[PDB]
Amino acid sequence: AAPLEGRNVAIASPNAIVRAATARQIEAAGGRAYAAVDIASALAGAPADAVLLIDAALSGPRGALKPPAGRRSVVLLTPEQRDRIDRLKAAGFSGYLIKPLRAASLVAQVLQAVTADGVDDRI
């Protein structure tokens, strides 16, 4: 009953209620939660192996949202924002979760999370 035992998961969200609720879901599943207000603070505050849960609330006005290169990221969407799935997958997101999050769905997308593309002897 601890499917995230020994897993690190960051939650980047500008919303206090989403950061606290998602951190409580990560920890109840046996994971370690790293709460941050945005992508830069999630990269600075979370272990290098953490899966990044990134709130689509952090998108630009036209919906641009870049998952960090060489990291494993899942985007949090409203049901009305499902039209963005193809663009967010093309940007390098592993998958999506629909707000409000189901614990079982969070666990499955963290366990299956895949890397975005991207990341000397010559003196």
Ligand X SMILES: Nc1nc2c(ncn2[C@@H]2O[C@@H]3COP(=O)(O)O[C@H]4[C@@H](O)[C@H](n5cnc6c(=O)[nH]c(N)nc65)O[C@@H]4COP(=O)(O)O[C@H]3[C@H]2O)c(=O)[nH]1
Binding residue (CB under 6 A) for ligand X from 97, 107, 110, 113: 97
34 is in an annotated binding site: no
To ligand X, the closest distance from the beta carbon of 59 in angstroms equals 17
Binding mask of the shown chain, residues 50 to 89, with x at each position contacting ligand X by CB under 6 A = ----------------------------------------
Which tokens go with 123?
A: 């003196």
DSSP assigned state of 39: H
> Is residue 62 left, alpha or beta, with left meaning phi > 0 and alpha meaning psi from -120 to 50?
alpha
Nearer to ligand X by Cβ, of 18 and 97: the residue is 97
Closest among 117, 17, 102 to 72, alpha carbons compared: 117
Residue 46, SS3?
Answer: coil
Min dist. Cβ of residue 79 to ligand X (A): 7
Annotated binding residue 71 = no
- Taking CB under 6 A as the criterion, the residue among 78, 102, 111, 118 binding ligand X is 102
The candidate with the shortest Cα–Cα distance to 67, out of 48, 43, 83, 46, is 43
Binding positions for ligand X, rule: CB under 6 A: 95-98, 100-105, 109
